[PDB]
Design a protein around this ligand. Structure first.
Ligand code: VO4
Length: 282
């Protein structure tokens, strides 16, 4: 079987060789380095590929797999918040999907600010949050939805819709069913906001560095990548993209940890198998 153990075995030696090869070296020129003392990375070993970096002071990357464009990033640190909101607005973010649980956010030791469920002022910017709906995606997983209104004097006000999956534990894989259900909710939400921009004649709709969904969990490599992988798979234009290319592209464009657990990989393999999609190149 193309999805047999032998094949999944081949898939692993490949991705594994790639993970070892991309592990950051001290002052690695392939990765963005923090400066002036301020901390850049949340996890010293989960770094940000310099070439595809969105901003110099955020750990966050522009990702494209096949034809799917997104921005995967780390849960911002308290200090990175003003820039993080700038990246949101100028990207004219169609949808912010946050995959970090409320209990991780609630744990004050983890240093994960509640930037999206509460109003605030971050430097020049002013944010306002408004909860809208709650969608059940299956297996007891819920997604709460907000709208963030970002304002900064002299800039045009931007609204961003957020889909927060509040109960997906770090280091785990939600099921293929919950997974595709979430990929859909994210696309639909993005497609509705993009259309609002389109019906308005914004230039951002023409620019391919803008209007990309932003997605992050805590580290931005596991839960964030399981979702990126599924969004790629429901884009019809991504036909014949193997699981090997998909994963290789996420790793070369952010870091080697992309698709952190082997079970998150497994869900990606199940969705593929169900599409008759290929695992291995050649
Ligand atoms: O915060 V996450 O990258 O799933 O492990």
């Amino acid at each position: 079987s193309p999805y047999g153990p032998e094949a999944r075995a081949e898939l692993s030696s490949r991705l594994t060789t790639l993970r070892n090869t991309l592990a950051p070296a001290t002052n690695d020129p392939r990765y963005l380095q923090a400066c002036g003392g301020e901390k850049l990375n949340r996890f010293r070993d989960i770094q940000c590929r310099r070439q595809t970096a969105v901003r110099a002071d955020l750990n966050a990357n522009y990702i494209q797999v096949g034809n799917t464009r997104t921005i995967a990033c780390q849960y911002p640190l308290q200090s990175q918040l003003e820039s993080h909101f700038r990246m949101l607005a100028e990207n004219r973010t169609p949808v912010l999907a946050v995959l970090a649980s409320s209990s991780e956010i609630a744990n004050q030791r983890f240093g994960m600010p509640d930037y999206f469920r509460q109003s605030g002022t971050y430097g020049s910017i002013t944010v306002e949050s408004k909860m809208t709906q709650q969608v059940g995606l299956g297996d007891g997983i819920m997604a709460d939805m907000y709208t963030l209104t970002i304002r900064e004097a002299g800039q045009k006000t931007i609204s961003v819709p957020v889909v927060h999956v509040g109960n997906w534990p770090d280091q785990t894989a939600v099921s293929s069913e919950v997974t595709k259900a979430l990929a859909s909710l994210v696309d639909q939400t993005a497609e509705t906001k993009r259309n609002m921009y389109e019906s308005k004649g914004s230039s951002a709709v023409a620019d391919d560095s803008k209007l990309r969904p932003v997605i992050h969990c805590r580290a931005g490599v596991g839960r964030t990548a399981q979702l990126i992988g599924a969004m790629c798979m429901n884009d019809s234009r991504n036909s014949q993209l193997s699981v090997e290319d998909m994963v290789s592209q996420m790793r070369v464009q952010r870091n080697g940890i992309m698709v952190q657990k082997d079970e998150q990989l497994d869900v990606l393999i199940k969705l593929a198998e169900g599409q008759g999609r290929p695992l291995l190149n050649s």
